[PDB]
């Protein structure tokens with residue numbers, strides 16, 4: 317009943333240096349799902365299902 | 378009843394240096410799921426199922 | 439009833455230097471699930487099933 | 500007598516990512532020479548003395 | 561007499577990722593020479609004395 | 622008389638990832654020479670004396 321947050325950090329990314337020399341990149345998706353190339357990403361959920369880089373499947377019923 | 382957080386860190390990424398020299402990258406997905414290339418990612422969930430880089434399957438019923 | 443966190447760290451990644459010289463990368467997925475290339479990732483869950491890099495299977499019913 | 504340069508590179512800097520988090524920087528020079536903080540610098544001389552970051556001395560005669 | 565350069569590289573820096581978290585930096589020079597903090601520097605001289613980060617002395621005669 | 626350079630490299634630095642977490646840095650020079658902190662530096666000289674990070678002395682005559 318006296319919660320005290322201070323200087324806290326949650327789902328935090330900082331201080332990222334990145335060099336990506338690539339002569340070629342290619343995704344050849346044929347009918348499917350694909351997720352590629354996530355970098356320096358931060359989420360924070362409450363009462364929820366939190367996905368960052370999901371390759372979810374073809375739901376059939 | 379007197380919770381005290383201070384300078385805490387949770388799901389935190391920091392101080393990442395990355396060099397990626399690649400002459401070729403390729404994902405040739407044919408009908409499937411794929412997740413590739415996650416870097417410096419941070420999540421934090423509460424009352425939820427948290428996935429970062431899932432390759433989930435084709436749900437059939 | 440007098441919880442005290444201080445300078446704590448949970449699901450934390452820091453101070454990562456990475457060099458990846460690769461002349462070729464390739465994922466040739468045909469109908470399946472794949473997860474590749476996770477680096478410097480941090481999660482924190484509460485009351486939830488937390489997966490980082492799962493290759494989950496084709497749920498059939 | 501048939502010099503052929505092609506795609507040559509000389510005194511070349513490229514592809515530099517830099518993060519510098521600093522809570523304090525200070526140079527307290529009292530009567531002297533100082534050089535600090537050179538980053539991503541490129542020179543090319545011909546028939547000359549080329550210095551990049553010199554701390555040269557008090558010439559007296 | 562048929563010199564052929566091609567795709568040559570000389571005094572070349574490339575693909576540098578750098579993270580520098582520092583709570584304090586300080587140079588307290590009192591009467592002297594100092595050189596500090598050179599990063600990703602490239603030179604190329606011909607018929608000349610080439611110094612990069614010299615701390616040269618007090619020439620007296 | 623048929624010199625052929627090709628894809629040569631000389632005085633070359635590439636693919637350097639560096640993380641430097643330092644709570645304090647300090648150079649307290651009193652009357653002297655100092656060189657500190659050289660990183661990813663490349664030189665190339667011809668008919669010349671090439672120094673990179675010299676701490677040269679007080680020339681007296």
Ligand SMILES: CNc1ccc(-c2nc3ccc(O)cc3s2)cc1
Nearest residue numbers: 361362363380422423424441484485
């Ligand atoms: C959003 N959903 C949620 C539910 C519950 C919580 C927490 N329950 C407790 C119990 C004891 C304790 O020392 C800390 C905590 S935090 C946090 C979030």
Ligand SMILES: CNc1ccc(-c2nc3ccc(O)cc3s2)cc1
Nearest residue numbers: 544545546563605606607624667668
């Ligand atoms: C500007 N000052 C200068 C003087 C001389 C030169 C060179 N002399 C030679 C001799 C033979 C050889 O195979 C290459 C070279 S390059 C380059 C520059």
